Amino acid sequence: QRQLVESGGGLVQPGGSLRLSCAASGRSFSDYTMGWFRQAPGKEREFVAAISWSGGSTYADSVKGRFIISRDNVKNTVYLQMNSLEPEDTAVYYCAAERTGWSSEYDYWGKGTPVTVSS
Amino acid sequence: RKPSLLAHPGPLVKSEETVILQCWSDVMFEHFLLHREGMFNDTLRLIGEHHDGVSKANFSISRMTQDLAGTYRCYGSVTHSPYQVSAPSDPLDIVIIGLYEKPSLSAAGENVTLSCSSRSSYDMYHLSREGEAHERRLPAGPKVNGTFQADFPLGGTYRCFGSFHDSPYEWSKSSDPLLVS
Amino acid sequence: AARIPAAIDAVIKGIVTKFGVSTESVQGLKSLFTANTYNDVTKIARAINEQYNPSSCLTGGSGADNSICPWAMENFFAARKIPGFIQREAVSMNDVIEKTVKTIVSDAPKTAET
Ligand SMILES: *[C@@H]1O[C@H](CO[C@@H]2O[C@@H](C)[C@@H](O)[C@@H](O)[C@@H]2O)[C@@H](O)[C@H](O)[C@H]1NC(C)=O
Ligand SMILES: *[C@@H]1O[C@H](CO)[C@@H](O)[C@H](O)[C@H]1NC(C)=O
């Protein structure tokens, strides 16, 4: 049903900030739970944040207090405001969608956006 | 008269997650009785909220548990002195999903059949068409490949689930969705 | 002299006279009315729901003797307002049974002793 496209990735200094965006082009967007995941070099893909169909947010403990997830149901977009970035945050960031109420999985995935926190 | 009962965003709910059950009718019921049939039976008395000819009531599950999974039916409350309740709504299954390994799902005017397979010894398989409140169920049979299966004849987006006999409302993780076109 | 068996018998008499169910039926739960679980409010409320199925009273009942249905009508189905759950958008009958059991268990040492 969906096709997700991430943007906003790039090079940033430690303590810097970056805002990622995800454009979703499918029906019933407001009913999906939208998530952000990341894969650092040599590591498994991990959960970073999620925004429920109701607007409620969830964060990975490694990102708690520094990142903010938000959604825009008019534009069908998801955001990840990443503040206080450290070199440990260097990863490819993925946008994903879950058809809550019909699936237990994030079935839809974007191709990623690279985030590098230098030195 | 029979009210309507739906689940938002859907009736296939992950553990500890949320679902809203909505009772509604064009008959202005002061109250609604939401009955659950399952491992822990219960009735919920909901205030009938009135607006522009409709009576609605929401039952929000803020954290999905085994106790809250079951077949739900909504009734409108008619009178208190000559005690009267309406006909029940169509049954709605509220299921806990994501508990076991995900099964595999395989596929104008032609007969299409969808198959539910897993190496896990599920007793029942459930086919789900996304957006449609009711699910189809079928028992599992063993194959010589060490895999259990169920074929669903269709005669949308689809997902497959497995479950055990002793817990009919606790399903596995959904299979990868299969778009039928 | 027998402080605990008296408290177990007071909880049983409390359930009987409050819920209107038979003495024999409440006493059937032998594992429940022991010295370690006679005052376990959660287990007793769940046992009452499991054994009497008060949700079967939804349509009204049948007039069967020692049925929980008159209690369920007066305190849930046909109540103008539910005591303890007043001005509440959603009320669970199991929570109403649990609040009733909690009052029974609290008033048991007061009644048996006196
Ligand atoms: C749990 O409830 C099951 C079904 O409930 C009955 O049917 C629904 C549609 C309503 O009419 C309701 O008032 C009825 O009670 C029972 O079959 C089952 O035995 C119950 N479980 C226990 C342990 O009592
Ligand atoms: C009931 O829940 C539905 C689904 O979330 C929602 O659209 C509706 O606004 C709710 N009703 C009330 C009275 O808030």
Residue numbers in the entry:
A (entry chain C): 1 to 119
B (entry chain B): 27 to 133, 141 to 188, 194 to 219
C (entry chain A): 9 to 122
From the paper:
Previous studies showed that repetitive interspersed family (RIFIN) proteins, displayed on the surfaces of Plasmodium falciparum-infected erythrocytes, can bind to inhibitory immune receptors and dampen NK cell activation, reducing parasite killing. Killer immunoglobulin-like receptors (KIRs) are expressed on NK cells and consist of pairs of inhibitory and activating immune receptors. Here we identified a clade of RIFINs that bind to inhibitory immune receptor KIR2DL1 more strongly than KIR2DL1 binds to the human ligand (MHC class I). To show how RIFINs bind to KIR2DL1, we determined the structures of RBK21 and KEN-01, each bound to KIR2DL1.
For KEN-01, we expressed the variable domain (159–288) and crystallized it in complex with KIR2DL1 and a KIR2DL1-binding nanobody. The nanobody was included as a crystallization chaperone. Data were collected at 2.17 Å, and molecular replacement allowed structure determination, this time with a single copy of the complex in the asymmetric unit. The variable regions of both RBK21 and KEN-01 consisted of a helical bundle that presented extended loops and short helices at the KIR-proximal end. These RIFINs share 87% sequence identity, and structural alignment showed a root-mean-square deviation of 2.0 Å. In both cases, the KIR2DL1 binding site was formed from two helices and two loops, which contacted the D1 domain of KIR2DL1, with a conserved binding pose despite only 53% of the KIR2DL1-contacting residues being shared. The binding site was centred around a conserved hydrophobic core, with L224 and F242 from each RIFIN occupying a shallow hydrophobic pocket containing residues L59, Y101 and V111 of KIR2DL1. This was stabilized by an intermolecular β-sheet, which contained loop 4 of RBK21 or KEN-01 and ended with a hydrogen bond linking S258 of RBK21 or KEN-01 and D68 of KIR2DL1. Other differences included a variable network of hydrogen bonds and interactions involving R212 of KEN-01, which formed a salt bridge with D93, and a cation–π interaction with F66 of KIR2DL1, both of which were absent in RBK21.
